From a paper:
Kallikrein-related peptidases (KLKs) compose a family of 15 secreted serine proteases which orchestrate a protease cross-activation network known as the KLK activome, with a variety of roles in homeostasis and disease. However, a current lack of approaches to specifically detect active KLKs has limited previous studies to measuring total mRNA or protein levels rather than functional KLK activity. KLKs are secreted from the cell as inactive pro-KLKs and must be subsequently cleaved to generate the active form, while endogenous protease inhibitors can further modulate KLK activity. Here, we report discovery and development of the first selective and potent activity-based probes (ABPs) and inhibitors for KLK6 and their application in cellular models of PDAC. We next investigated the binding mode of KLK6 ABPs by X-ray crystallography, to illuminate the unnatural amino acid interactions underpinning biochemical potency and specificity.
An optimal balance of potency and selectivity was found for DPhe–Ser(Z)–Dht–ArgPP (P4 to P1), with potency driven primarily by P2 l-Dht and P3 l-Ser(Z), and P4 d-Phe providing selectivity, as the only d-amino acid tolerated by KLK6 but not by KLK8. Biotinylated (bABP 17), alkyne-tagged (YnABP 19), and Cy5-tagged (fABP 21) ABPs were synthesized and validated in biochemical assays. bABP 17 is highly potent for KLK6 (kobs/I = 11,000 M–1 s–1), selective over KLK7 (>30-fold) and KLK8 (>70-fold), and >600-fold selective over two serine proteases particularly highly expressed in PDAC: urokinase plasminogen activator (uPA) and tissue plasminogen activator (tPA)33. ABPs were synthesized as a 50/50 mixture of diastereoisomers epimeric at the warhead, which were separated by HPLC to yield the paired active ABP and control inactive isomer (17/18 and 19/20). Polar interactions observed between His57/Gly195 and oxygens of the phosphonate are consistent with transition-state mimicry typical for an aryl phosphonate warhead. The P3 l-Ser(Z) side chain contacts an extended hydrophobic patch extending out of the S3 pocket (Ile220), offering an explanation for the increase in potency observed on switching from P3 l-Cha to P3 l-Ser(Z), since bABP 16 shows a less optimal fit in this area of the protein with a less defined binding mode for P3 that varies between the two KLK6 chains in the crystal structure.
Numbering used by the authors: 16 to 36, 38 to 67, 69 to 125, 127 to 130, 132 to 147, 150 to 205, 210 to 247
Write the structure that this text describes.
């Protein structure tokens, strides 16, 4: 993510790192000891999940690694439009919760009043490189009508937009599937956005997690 800075060590216990072939692919969000939520476009064979991470290159006492035994892509995911960009990853064993590994509760209210949010991830930073330390930035939700104005014909009710008019703080490549946290609830998942990354003019676009309460509950409880 661009124009942010390193997160506080204790402030992101729900952040997941998704790896393939030993390298970062995407972010994700622990929402249940057995399940990580992420973007459908992060689907690849052989996903590996790391919980409790802060610095990717360090072997950290708090980290847990888990293979993914099932990846449930939303049935209505449309890769071409990025609509319904959400997927559930079943962990091979329940995460062992701690101060540094905790689920994040979902925002169930699509009309929730908190409009200032945090985004987090190990995606590309403003220098064009990938960071070792997880990055954080504070941004603000943008109305449907304003975001539709930025991306005509491309925004659905399953998307939520957020950005920063002053510095352009924004998610970027490698942040997909990571969390947009508003009022200490999961409000969105990093999905897509402008090229170059940077939200001064066009906001970042996030999967609208409040729309997926029923499917998530059904999938976890099966």
């Amino acid at each position: 993510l661009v124009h942010g800075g390193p997160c506080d060590k204790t402030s992101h216990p729900y952040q997941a790192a998704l790896y393939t072939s030993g390298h970062l692919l995407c972010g994700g969000v622990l929402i249940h000891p057995l399940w990580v939520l992420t973007a459908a476009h992060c689907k690849k064979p052989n996903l590996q999940v790391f919980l409790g991470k802060h610095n990717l290159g360090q072997q950290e006492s708090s980290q847990e690694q888990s293979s993914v035994v099932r990846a449930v892509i939303h049935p209505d995911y449309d890769a071409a439009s990025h609509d319904q960009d959400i997927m559930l990853l079943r962990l091979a064993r329940p995460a062992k919760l701690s101060e540094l590994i905790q689920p994040l509760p979902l925002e169930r209210d699509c009309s929730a009043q908190t409009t200032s949010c945090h985004i987090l991830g190990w995606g590309k930073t403003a220098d064009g490189d990938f960071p070792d330390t997880i990055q954080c930035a504070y941004i603000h939700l943008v109305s449907r009508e304003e975001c539709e104005h930025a991306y005509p014909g491309q925004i659905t009710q399953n998307m939520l937009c957020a950005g920063d008019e002053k510095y352009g703080k924004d998610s970027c490549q490698g942040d997909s599937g990571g969390p947009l946290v508003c009022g200490d609830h999961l409000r969105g998942l990093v999905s897509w956005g402008n090229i170059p990354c940077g939200s001064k003019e066009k906001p970042g676009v996030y999967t609208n997690v409040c729309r997926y309460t029923n499917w998530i509950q059904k999938t976890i409880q099966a």
